[PDB]
Amino acid sequence: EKYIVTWDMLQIHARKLASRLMPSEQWKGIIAVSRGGLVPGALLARELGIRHVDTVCISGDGEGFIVIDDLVDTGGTAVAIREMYPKAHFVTIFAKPAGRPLVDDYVVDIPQDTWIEQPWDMGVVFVPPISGR
Amino acid sequence: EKYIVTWDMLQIHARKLASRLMPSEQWKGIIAVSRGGLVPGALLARELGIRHVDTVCISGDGEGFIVIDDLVDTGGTAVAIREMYPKAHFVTIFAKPAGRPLVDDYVVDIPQDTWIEQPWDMGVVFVPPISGR
Amino acid sequence: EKYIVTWDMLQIHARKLASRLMPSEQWKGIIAVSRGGLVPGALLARELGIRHVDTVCISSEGDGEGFIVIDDLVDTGGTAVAIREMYPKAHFVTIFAKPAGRPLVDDYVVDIPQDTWIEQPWDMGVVFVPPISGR
Amino acid sequence: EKYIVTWDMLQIHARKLASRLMPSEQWKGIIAVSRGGLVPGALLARELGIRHVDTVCISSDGEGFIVIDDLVDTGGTAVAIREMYPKAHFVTIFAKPAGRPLVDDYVVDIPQDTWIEQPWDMGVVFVPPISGR
Numbered sequence: 313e314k315y316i317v318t319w320d321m322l323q324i325h326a327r328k329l330a331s332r333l334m335p336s337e338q339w340k341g342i343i344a345v346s347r348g349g350l351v352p353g354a355l356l357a358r359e360l361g362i363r364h365v366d367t368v369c370i371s372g373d374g375e376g377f378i379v380i381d382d383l384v385d386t387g388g389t390a391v392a393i394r395e396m397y398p399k400a401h402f403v404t405i406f407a408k409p410a411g412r413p414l415v416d417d418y419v420v421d422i423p424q425d426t427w428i429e430q431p432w433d434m435g436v437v438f439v440p441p442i443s444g445r
Numbered sequence: 446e447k448y449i450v451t452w453d454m455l456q457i458h459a460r461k462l463a464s465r466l467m468p469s470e471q472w473k474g475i476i477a478v479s480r481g482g483l484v485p486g487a488l489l490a491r492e493l494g495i496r497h498v499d500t501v502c503i504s505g506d507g508e509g510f511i512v513i514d515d516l517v518d519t520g521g522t523a524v525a526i527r528e529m530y531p532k533a534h535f536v537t538i539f540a541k542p543a544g545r546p547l548v549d550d551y552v553v554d555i556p557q558d559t560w561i562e563q564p565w566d567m568g569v570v571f572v573p574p575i576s577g578r
Numbered sequence: 579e580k581y582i583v584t585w586d587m588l589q590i591h592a593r594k595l596a597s598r599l600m601p602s603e604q605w606k607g608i609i610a611v612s613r614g615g616l617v618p619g620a621l622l623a624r625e626l627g628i629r630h631v632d633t634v635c636i637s638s639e640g641d642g643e644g645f646i647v648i649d650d651l652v653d654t655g656g657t658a659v660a661i662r663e664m665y666p667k668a669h670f671v672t673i674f675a676k677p678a679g680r681p682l683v684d685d686y687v688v689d690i691p692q693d694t695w696i697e698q699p700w701d702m703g704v705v706f707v708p709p710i711s712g713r
Numbered sequence: 714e715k716y717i718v719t720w721d722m723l724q725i726h727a728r729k730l731a732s733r734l735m736p737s738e739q740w741k742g743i744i745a746v747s748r749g750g751l752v753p754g755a756l757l758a759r760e761l762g763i764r765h766v767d768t769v770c771i772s773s774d775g776e777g778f779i780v781i782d783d784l785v786d787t788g789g790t791a792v793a794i795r796e797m798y799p800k801a802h803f804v805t806i807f808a809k810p811a812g813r814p815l816v817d818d819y820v821v822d823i824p825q826d827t828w829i830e831q832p833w834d835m836g837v838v839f840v841p842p843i844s845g846r
């Protein structure tokens with residue numbers, strides 16, 4: 313019940329999201345939710361050729377701005393974004409069921425009780441064999 | 446649709462398969478189908494603590510042997526394996542729907558029409574941004 | 579030839595940079611230079627437990643005191659000098675450095691020879707590569 | 714002396730080794746030393762276009778063949794191999810100082826007091842952040 317997101321896979325998902333976001337010229341900018349959306353944001357910015365990357369922290373119109381986070385679950389962040397950026401295009405990479413109807417787009421379905429680990433919280437490390445033989 | 450198998454992901458599936466082949470001592474060795482089964486074979490051998498790794502090329506009876514290939518589709522390979530090693534336990538990492546019942550064990554379901562690419566056939570290389578913006 | 583930086587390696591270098599910047603609490607925040615500094619910035623923020631990540635874009639207040647400013651690579655020092663003018667008191671770091679730019683950064687991790695071309699993992703992907711022999 | 718070798722990096726080395734074993738048709742087969750040489754051997758097989766991959770196990774004439782292991786250190790393994798296959802071309806990916814001239818080819822020089830960790834003994838796992846802040 314643990315979902316491992318490797319860097320390569322994250323990048324594959326982000327490129328899929330970026331192609332759906334084409335043409336790039338419809339967008340003025342990218343706003344990354346600190347800090348889960350920072351990496352997915354950098355990835356969109358690279359693929360869409362958008363240099364205007366901003367961050368917003370959560371403890372303005374927004375039309376033509378992509379607002380990105382890594383995951384939607386409850387949708388609390390999605391709600392909070394709408395306060396200052398009600399016309400923004402809110403997207404995430406991953407979505408759990410309750411958050412699915414609260415985003416403008418997402419790439420991968422994740423079940424509610426699955427724990428997803430993001431690659432910035434992981435590393436390549438020695439792992440003992442499954443069998444002591 | 447193009448399915449990309451990264452090394453990290455391949456290894457994750459191999460470990461999932463290995464814990465299903467637990468306990469290890471029930472096995473005497475492993476036979477890898479050249480060349481698709483070579484790497485998954487190596488990984489199984491590591492995770493099970495088995496040094497006896499053999500190979501077979503497809504143009505002894507197999508008792509207590511694991512026979513591994515990367516992907517089952519038609520089951521042509523499975524047939525030959527069953528003829529050479531009727532007493533052997535045949536597994537793959539990936540299975541397309543036709544092959545699904547022709548293996549004793551597998552890990553990942555692949556659609557019939559999806560093209561899967563294995564990491565030994567790929568490499569990390571510059572890829573032009575999706576947008577020229 | 580080309581120096582390939584994979585995601586795994588970049589992260590190893592960022593963690594090394596993070597350990598040197600310890601203890602975290604001596605820092606108010608992180609300013610990532612868009613776009614090269616964004617991922618290295620995000621990695622630093624995770625490792626130092628800093629939630630306050632800003633960005634700066636250079637084209638073509640504060641003095642930055644207590645802030646880390648991060649970019650991917652220093653070479654000429656064009657970005658560096660703009661960063662000095664804009665943030666005279668920030669600690670300016672990169673992951674990679676070519677010899678021309680070394681004296682202009684407060685800290686970096688990997689020395690890259692001047693004429694080496696380095697490819698960052700956000701510009702790369704896992705793709706089919708034809709075998710070396712046709713046989 | 715904490716040297717992490719990832720899958721991508723291993724594959725880069727194996728491709729470099731394959732290139733210097735060119736032209737391919739001068740070889741008739743590859744013999745992988747189990748278990749260290751299996752993945753490298755599999756990679757050589759793909760790159761040189763050799764379907765004929767065998768294995769050999771050593772515990773405690775080979776003409777026109779490549780025998781491959783992951784690393785030479787003492788050369789003890791090389792000795793057994795020269796005895797078994799006096800005309801084989803013996804190659805490794807990595808070589809520590811005592812072993813370097815004891816193989817016909819290698820790619821990476823490794824210091825004696827460096828411990829390298831191969832990617833089949835590792836995995837992507839959660840790593841606590843450097844600061845608890």
Ligand SMILES: Nc1nc2c(ncn2[C@H]2CN(C(=O)CP(=O)(O)O)C[C@H]2O)c(=O)[nH]1
Nearest residue numbers: 383384385386387388389411426427428429
């Ligand atoms: N790494 C990881 N994080 C998770 C997981 N599930 C929930 N989250 C996060 C969701 N979250 C948010 O602020 C987003 P939202 O709930 O839509 O406002 C805080 C975290 O709990 C999970 O399986 N793995």
Ligand SMILES: Nc1nc2c(ncn2[C@H]2CN(C(=O)CP(=O)(O)O)C[C@H]2O)c(=O)[nH]1
Nearest residue numbers: 516517518519520521522523544559560561
């Ligand atoms: N790389 C890759 N290979 C594939 C794919 N689908 C089928 N194969 C192979 C399956 N195969 C076999 O000999 C095994 P079997 O069909 O069970 O006897 C030959 C190939 O066509 C695919 O999506 N990608």
Ligand SMILES: Nc1nc2c(ncn2[C@H]2CN(C(=O)CP(=O)(O)O)C[C@H]2O)c(=O)[nH]1
Nearest residue numbers: 651652653654655656657679694695696698
């Ligand atoms: N990916 C990669 N980028 C490079 C390389 N060498 C130079 N750069 C960049 C450095 N750069 C900057 O604005 C930073 P600075 O030169 O200190 O002002 C522009 C690019 O030319 C290289 O080998 N690889």
Ligand SMILES: Nc1nc2c(ncn2[C@H]2CN(C(=O)CP(=O)(O)O)C[C@H]2O)c(=O)[nH]1
Nearest residue numbers: 784785786787788789790791827828829831
């Ligand atoms: N993964 C890894 N393995 C190592 C290392 N150094 C030595 N080895 C192995 C080399 N070895 C051999 O039998 C080869 P040889 O000594 O030439 O006959 C057994 C292990 O000690 C190391 O840094 N990393």
